[PDB]
Design a protein around this ligand. Structure first.
Ligand SMILES: [Mg+2]
Ligand SMILES: [Mg+2]
Ligand SMILES: [Mg+2]
Ligand SMILES: [Mg+2]
Ligand SMILES: [Mg+2]
Ligand SMILES: [Mg+2]
Ligand SMILES: [Mg+2]
Ligand SMILES: [Mg+2]
Ligand SMILES: [Mg+2]
Ligand SMILES: [Mg+2]
Ligand SMILES: [Mg+2]
Ligand SMILES: [Mg+2]
Ligand SMILES: [Mg+2]
Ligand SMILES: [Mg+2]
Ligand SMILES: [Mg+2]
Ligand SMILES: [Mg+2]
Ligand SMILES: [Mg+2]
Ligand SMILES: [Mg+2]
Ligand SMILES: [Mg+2]
Ligand SMILES: [Mg+2]
Ligand SMILES: [Mg+2]
Ligand SMILES: [Mg+2]
Ligand SMILES: [Mg+2]
Ligand SMILES: [Mg+2]
Ligand SMILES: [Mg+2]
Ligand SMILES: [Mg+2]
Ligand SMILES: [Mg+2]
Ligand SMILES: [Mg+2]
Ligand SMILES: [Mg+2]
Ligand SMILES: [Mg+2]
Ligand SMILES: [Mg+2]
Ligand SMILES: [Mg+2]
Ligand SMILES: [Mg+2]
Ligand SMILES: [Mg+2]
Ligand SMILES: [Mg+2]
Ligand SMILES: [Mg+2]
Ligand SMILES: [Mg+2]
Ligand SMILES: [Mg+2]
Ligand SMILES: [Mg+2]
Length: 354
RNA sequence: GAGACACGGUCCAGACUCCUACGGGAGGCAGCAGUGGGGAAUAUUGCACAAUGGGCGCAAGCCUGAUGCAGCCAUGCCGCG
RNA sequence: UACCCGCAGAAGAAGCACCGGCUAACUCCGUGCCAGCAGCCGCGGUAAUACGGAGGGUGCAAGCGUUAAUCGGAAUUACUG
RNA sequence: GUACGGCCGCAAGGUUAAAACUCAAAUGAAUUGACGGGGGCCCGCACAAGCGGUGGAGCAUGUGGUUUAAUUCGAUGCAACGCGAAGAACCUUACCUGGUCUUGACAUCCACGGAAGUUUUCAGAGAUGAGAAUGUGCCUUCGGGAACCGUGAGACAGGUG
RNA sequence: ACGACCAGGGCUACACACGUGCUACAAUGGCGCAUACAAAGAGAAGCGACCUCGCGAGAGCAAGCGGACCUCAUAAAGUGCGUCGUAGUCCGGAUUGGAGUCUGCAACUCGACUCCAUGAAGUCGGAAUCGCUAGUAAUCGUGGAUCAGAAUGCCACGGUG
RNA sequence: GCCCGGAUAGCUCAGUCGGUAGAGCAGGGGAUUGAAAAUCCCCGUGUCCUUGGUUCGAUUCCGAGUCCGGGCACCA
RNA sequence: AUAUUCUAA
RNA sequence: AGCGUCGAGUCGGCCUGCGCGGAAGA
RNA sequence: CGAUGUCGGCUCAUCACAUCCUGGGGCUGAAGUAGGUCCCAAGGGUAUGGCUGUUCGCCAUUUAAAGUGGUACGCGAGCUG
């Protein structure tokens, strides 16, 4: 975390090379993706320099006078300066806190039973409750589209839309395996069992606007229809082939004797086929996106472990362990989320162009 | 030819490599060393005919990558630090 | 060249595998069904003689392990049996 | 005992008969149990025979849940739920909010300075802080202490974590 | 500071679900008046008589008793006589208003008790389910621990049966 | 494009033809069970597709749409 | 006459 | 208008007449 | 309606220009090469196959280019069927 904020000072000075000189002013293109990079990590740098002024003072705060007598009375002045540097860390949060429009949008919280059968399902229930209680705290509107209840309680699957301002900015990190280690409720011998649940947090995609079939994006071919119908069918351009140039979808229609009916029928079909083909892409995109977020339901594939015996939650990607499980299960998730958002932004502002 | 259907002979055909004045020619490391390649992996383009053997010779000798030796490698066995 | 004699000075010369059982050799720290180990049985899910390091120990030693391959153990193709 | 091939068959199929791959077992008999909607024999308000309740009402009380700054922690089939608690207004109290302390509310150890106690005032929600009178006893080699209070250490105390 | 001190809050929250109790729905009863018959137990910062005052909870004054002595302390169901006459009642006593009492630095959150007023649900409880074999069940009072105060709980005690 | 039928509880369906809607399965609460089913008791559930009329009053009777299903779009 | 089921340390 | 200089007209609306473009086929 | 033979192919065409190529230009978000777009221009030129009765279309491979239309969607007293 501190090592990352050091890497900002590494990419703070090399950029701060040209102000009113002649090197990168030749092309405004490359300069545009450089001057704007400075601005983002400039606010964080100056605030970090203020924190890098207080640390070293602690190694000369123990004894400033020399003899131990007034040192403790003098330390109270440096103790107040330590409380000020604590507020600089409280600011650090706000300077990292993300400002990307994608974070503000709403989110579909999908929770599925991993390995553990009924026990997994009971813990899906405990996770969904934990998110629900976290969603109603900060005051979001959580509502259930699809539930599949387990035999002994909980859910085999629970899909809930969580609606507010900044949902997908705080729940994006819940995606993946959640491993639970406890004596289940479905357990006769008092044995500890290790179940997992998969959580997918997918952001709300702007519904799906079925667009108008622009006639300038059509090639319409008229020609003689095939088969029976005497002189009329010999001589009449009844048959329609509408080729949609964008997609490349082509629909032929010669079911009726009138070109107008055929053309009408073909536009209808070409509509249906264009609108079915794009809704297929969306399903595939969603299916693949979900597949990746979930991972396997196996106990080995996890971002977080909830060990009830020890009352330990341990996020595995930010090697963090808290003995505050009872709190976390009641939906005080800002013990776990905050750090993850810090270390995510620490990387974003460190690696943008590189 | 005593002996071969002949490793470093002949003829034909074939594929491959090379030379060519384009007409035509040349060649065969499964000797020793060595090169490329293949491979988990296997050595020096030494020295000498002094010894033992072989060819020819009356013999002296000449030839002998057989052989005797050296080089390389903990590859093994044995011995010693 | 083998071998012999002289000179100086401990001087120039120790590693490799293993230590849960089978199997000779045990403890501490770290990790927390992860990372990893593993010939078989198995070990590891916050008090690990089994993982990784350390200290100690055992076995081999200019080798030591691993892998491959063969017979053995296998009376598990049995002639012996 | 399957595939492929062969032979047989009207067919159904039979017959002959592999391999890959996979597991560290699979298996036989017997032993101790446990279990059976197996058998036999017994017992207990276990049923039956009775009597009175609970489940509905209002209230008490505990719990789950929900709520909350906090609703402290524990008990959870029988064998948790008027249970730990034989008694939460303060105290208790472990919880929350705010105000405070840092060898420290509670111990031992050392140095320094003071007898304790006694009344009284102000500020403060109180903790606490700042004053002012008021004593300077008890053991005594009248050198020293030990009755307990302050102040400074750093060994540690402290923790219903 | 996950240690320590303090004030004030909270453990008493309330769409709801369950357990354990209490009180009822009445006439084998209610109310009024009169009147019998227990056991067991507690008591010194304690139990507190008598007398006086108060509708009452209580208050004042104060004996006695570390108790087979004094106090708590009137047992109640029962019995006799009266009334009510089957009504949501002269059943039931929730809830709420007003006015008090006492404990306690302090009863707002959050005490118990008293008085006047108020007079809810409830007319014997669906599926179900509990206890009990005799001085038992059922029903009737009585005491104690904890405790300043604060039992319908608990632990004891007799009565009727 | 036209035509016939349909739109009623969460799902599948009755019903009514002017007033005052049901069923089964879901759902909720209780019970039974060591627990989950099955079972048992108690409950709730609808703007009667959307509009614009007629009417004192429309789920019901008109006239539009919308969605669904079933025809048909022919003679040549 | 009717009695199904019990994952995974 | 042209570039303060230069020395008579000048500017763009209205009413209306006739024309111009817009105007490619076997 | 006392008959004006109807698709496509074949053969043979002929005209228009709203130009596919070649010729001449303006503008270009025209550096060059190559394009875009609009104007002028009808002299000449303007695929062969696979599939399908096909017209159309898709596909293969060409070409400077494989124009768009009219002609009883030209052409059965010319062929096919
Ligand atoms: Mg030869
Ligand atoms: Mg050769
Ligand atoms: Mg060679
Ligand atoms: Mg190689
Ligand atoms: Mg030679
Ligand atoms: Mg051993
Ligand atoms: Mg082997
Ligand atoms: Mg053998
Ligand atoms: Mg067979
Ligand atoms: Mg066969
Ligand atoms: Mg019975
Ligand atoms: Mg009740
Ligand atoms: Mg609790
Ligand atoms: Mg608990
Ligand atoms: Mg505990
Ligand atoms: Mg416990
Ligand atoms: Mg309190
Ligand atoms: Mg505090
Ligand atoms: Mg307090
Ligand atoms: Mg409580
Ligand atoms: Mg009454
Ligand atoms: Mg007492
Ligand atoms: Mg009533
Ligand atoms: Mg009655
Ligand atoms: Mg008995
Ligand atoms: Mg009683
Ligand atoms: Mg008491
Ligand atoms: Mg009794
Ligand atoms: Mg099943
Ligand atoms: Mg004109
Ligand atoms: Mg005629
Ligand atoms: Mg032209
Ligand atoms: Mg011409
Ligand atoms: Mg000319
Ligand atoms: Mg073609
Ligand atoms: Mg034509
Ligand atoms: Mg024609
Ligand atoms: Mg023809
Ligand atoms: Mg003709």
């Amino acid at each position: 975390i501190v090592a990352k904020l050091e890497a900002l000072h590494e990419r703070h000075e090399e950029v701060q090379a040209l102000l009113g000189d002649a090197q990168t002013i030749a092309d405004q293109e490359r300069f545009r993706a450089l001057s704007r990079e400075y601005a983002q990590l400039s606010d964080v740098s100056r605030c970090f320099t203020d924190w890098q002024q207080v640390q070293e003072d602690i190694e000369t705060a123990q004894m400033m006078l020399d003899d131990p007598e007034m040192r403790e009375m003098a330390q109270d002045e440096l103790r107040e300066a330590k409380e000020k540097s604590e507020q600089l860390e409280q600011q650090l949060q706000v300077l990292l806190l993300p400002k990307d429009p994608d974070d503000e949008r709403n989110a579909f919280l999908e929770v599925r039973a991993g390995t553990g059968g009924d026990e997994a399902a009971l813990f899906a229930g405990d996770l969904f409750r934990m998110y629900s209680r976290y969603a109603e705290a900060r005051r979001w509107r959580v509502e259930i589209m699809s539930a599949s209840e387990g035999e002994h309680g909980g859910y085999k699957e629970i899909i809930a839309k969580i609606s507010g301002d900044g949902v997908y900015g705080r729940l994006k990190f819940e995606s993946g395996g959640h491993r639970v280690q406890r004596v289940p409720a479905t357990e006769s011998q008092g044995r500890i069992h290790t179940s997992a649940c998969t959580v997918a947090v997918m952001p709300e995609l702007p519904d799906a606007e079925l667009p108008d079939i622009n006639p300038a994006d059509l090639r319409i071919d008229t020609f003689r229809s095939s088969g029976a119908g005497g002189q009329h069918v010999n001589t009449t351009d009844s048959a329609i082939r509408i080729t949609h140039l964008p997609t490349g979808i082509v629909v032929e229609c010669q079911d009726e004797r009138s070109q107008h009916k055929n053309k009408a029928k073909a536009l209808s079909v070409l509509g249906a086929r264009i609108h079915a083909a794009e809704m297929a892409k969306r399903q595939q995109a969603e299916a693949s996106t979900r597949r990746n977020l979930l991972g396997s339901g196996d106990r080995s594939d996890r971002n977080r472990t909830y060990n009830f015996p020890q009352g330990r939650v341990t996020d595995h990607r930010i090697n963090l362990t808290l003995y505050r499980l009872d709190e976390v299960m009641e939906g005080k998730l800002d013990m776990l989320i905050e750090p993850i958002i810090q270390e995510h932004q620490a990387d974003q502002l460190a690696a943008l162009s590189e």
